[PDB]
Amino acid sequence: DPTLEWFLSHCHIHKYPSKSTLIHQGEKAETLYYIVKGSVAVLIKDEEGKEMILSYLNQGDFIGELGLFEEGQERSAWVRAKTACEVAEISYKKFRQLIQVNPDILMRLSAQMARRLQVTSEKVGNLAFLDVTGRIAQTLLNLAKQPDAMTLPDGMQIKITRQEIGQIVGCSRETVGRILKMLEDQNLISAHGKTIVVYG
Amino acid sequence: DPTLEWFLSHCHIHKYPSKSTLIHQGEKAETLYYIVKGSVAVLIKDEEGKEMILSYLNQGDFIGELGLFEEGQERSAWVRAKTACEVAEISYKKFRQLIQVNPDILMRLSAQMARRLQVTSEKVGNLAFLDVTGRIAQTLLNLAKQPDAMTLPDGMQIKITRQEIGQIVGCSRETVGRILKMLEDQNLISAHGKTIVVY
Ligand SMILES: Nc1ncnc2c1ncn2[C@@H]1O[C@@H]2COP(=O)(O)O[C@H]2[C@H]1O
Ligand SMILES: Nc1ncnc2c1ncn2[C@@H]1O[C@@H]2COP(=O)(O)O[C@H]2[C@H]1O
Ligand SMILES: Nc1ncnc2c1ncn2[C@@H]1O[C@@H]2COP(=O)(O)O[C@H]2[C@H]1O
């Protein structure tokens, strides 16, 4: 792809092991990142430091974009490598140069920002309006329609744990496991420890 | 500034009265808006019509931007006029030509998307981390720090209805009543009718 190849030619790319923290909330934002390979979680915390997963991001996703457009912003969340990752980086200052050369690279970034706003808005509604079963059900549907979901003969395979679902919907891992058992009994899913199949 | 004035010169300007809906969730998105004057509320809804305010947007804000970057999308929320509004409107197709001539106009729009993502993400953490009591406590603390809060001898007085609290925190007006009474019992606020005093 020529636009993304040109862009990456102006970055420097680095390897990070699984569980590396790429971005820390509250740091000064001066750098944009782009996932060449691997997956990350975007995390926020409560007052006791307890984590919740705000999003997962994958190969082809920009990260660290939110301070690009205004001076002196701070990182809004933590970003942690869930797998080993290969991440391109570029300063905000150089990226702003690229945008004046070819605004298509800003369109590619902004498209992802717009998607994230859509997804995060929907999460506000799920948290505001739905009971725990309904939040879990939506979370499974959403994971199943991700590009990384694998098609099986009986449905979509997703890679997630009860603790991760809990950290998405705001309940305990035990509560998630009870609800997954209900959804299994209803013949809607098959739930293992690290994998769930959503039947279809 | 010259970028904004250049942009507006390519738009069709129109007026909405207070309480009108500018954008309905689920409609096909083909047009970008920009608020020249007035203010709007961005909301989402229950199946049962329960509402939650995602944001207020004001003069200078783009609206209807989320469908710009891929064809075939639907509007993600309702946008309703909180006051009479004058709004500039441009097709996505035309606006994409503008971006190529001067991408500063996209920087302006993407700057607002970034702020909205930060604000909405904070709302997700509040909803997920806090029970309805904690959400109300925190909403009252926040309102007490706003300019419309009235400093009194006993603390900061706010004027807000149970209804209005519910469409911030995600609970019904009756639930709001119960929590406020509990908080009062704990000698943290006084709460009666639409008048709250935060000690
Ligand atoms: N709601 C969200 N959805 C997806 N990614 C997010 C969200 N909130 C923050 N991030 C990412 O987490 C990064 C933290 O650093 P920045 O705020 O610079 O840029 C942020 C985004 O890349
Ligand atoms: N979380 C949010 N914060 C502020 N504005 C929003 C949010 N979600 C949706 N919008 C606005 O509401 C509009 C509804 O139509 P669009 O999805 O085209 O574009 C959307 C944005 O302009
Ligand atoms: N989960 C919820 N339960 C009830 N009302 C809600 C919820 N989330 C948002 N709301 C809105 O908050 C409002 C509070 O006042 P009402 O109960 O009259 O109407 C309510 C709804 O419009």
Author numbering:
A (entry chain B): 9 to 208
B (entry chain A): 9 to 207
Published text:
CAP is a 210-amino-acid transcription factor that binds cAMP generated by adenylyl cyclase in response to the phosphorylated form of Enzyme IIAGlc (phosphorylated in response to the phosphoenolpyruvate-carbohydrate phosphotransferase system). cAMP-bound CAP regulates the transcription of over 100 genes crucial for carbon utilization through its binding to a specific promoter region and recruitment of RNA polymerase. Previous studies of the ligand binding domain of CAP demonstrated negative cooperativity between cAMP binding sites in the absence of structural change within this domain. We produce coarse-grained models that describe global low-frequency protein backbone motions of CAP and show a strong correlation between negative cooperativity for cAMP and modulation of the delocalised normal modes on ligand binding without a requirement for a spatially distinct physical pathway or conformational change. We demonstrate experimentally that altered connectivity between backbone elements in CAP can give predictable alterations to cooperativity for cAMP binding through altered mode amplitudes.
We examined amino acids predicted to show altered (V132, H160) or neutral (V140) responses to altered amino acid side chain interactions. The ENM calculations predicted a reduction in the negative cooperativity of CAP in response to a reduction in the strength of the local interactions of residue H160. In particular, H160 was predicted to form interactions that contribute to allostery with D162 and Q165. The mutation H160L was predicted to break these interactions while maintaining side chain bulk; this was confirmed by X-ray crystallography of the H160L CAP protein. No overall change in H160L protein structure was evident compared to wild-type. ITC experiments demonstrated that cooperativity for cAMP became less negative as predicted by computation. This crucial experiment demonstrates that altering low-frequency motions at a site distant from both the ligand binding site as well as the dimer interface, and from any presumed physical pathway of structural change connecting these sites, can nonetheless give predictable effects on cooperativity.
